[PDB]
Amino acid sequence: MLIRRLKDARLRAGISQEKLGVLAGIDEASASARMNQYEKGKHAPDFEMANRLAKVLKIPVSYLYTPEDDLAQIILTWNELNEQERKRINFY
Amino acid sequence: MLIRRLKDARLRAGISQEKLGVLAGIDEASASARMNQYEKGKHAPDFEMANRLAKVLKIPVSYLYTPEDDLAQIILTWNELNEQERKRINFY
DNA sequence: AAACTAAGAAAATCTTAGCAA
DNA sequence: TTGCTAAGATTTTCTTAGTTT
């Protein structure tokens, strides 16, 4: 899990670390700490948690696991394309 | 990590679970077991290991973390494109 | 040969109780 | 308010020693 990806996505979502945690289902008593540990790279979330974070952040989960900046941008762009626009890439 | 992504990529590489493990730097004494645990979804590898696996399998690491079949295919295709080709999608 | 598994050892994360910016 | 951290409690993976396909 790439800490820069998590942080960038969180800041674009405009929410605090704690709020991101709460919305992803982490107990209010541990949300701030846990989300900070993830963003600072102290501990890694499991894939199930990453999926819940991605849901809150409105991103595809694999964005958080893509080190290649150009591919990560593609993933975010693809995310916002409608199903007809995706067909155009699919054929491509 | 998505066990089907790992299996599909390994089978395309034409290598055993053990061989994949050995090539990815897992000790010869535990490669078979660990690789199997990952592919069967018994335990998840950490991201560092996933990166080592992806290098052996000649895939971008985020393929292993992409649940969306259509995006996963984009990632696979993108992996094989040269610079000039990646430039034209980045535009598109 | 390759795939697979149990169980104890080992190492990781999670919760708690805060402090710092 | 938000970001951040230590450390013990908790939960996970890893190694070993195999059996199964």
TrEMBL record, chains A, B:
Short name of any one Pfam family annotated for the protein: HTH_3
Annotated GO MF terms: DNA binding
Domain HTH cro/C1-type, first and last residues per copy: 6-64
Transmembrane segments: none
InterPro entries: Cro/C1-type_HTH (IPR001387), Lambda_DNA-bd_dom_sf (IPR010982)
PROSITE patterns: HTH_CROC1 (PS50943)
Protein name per its UniProtKB record: Csp231I C protein
Organism for this UniProt entry: Citrobacter sp. RFL231
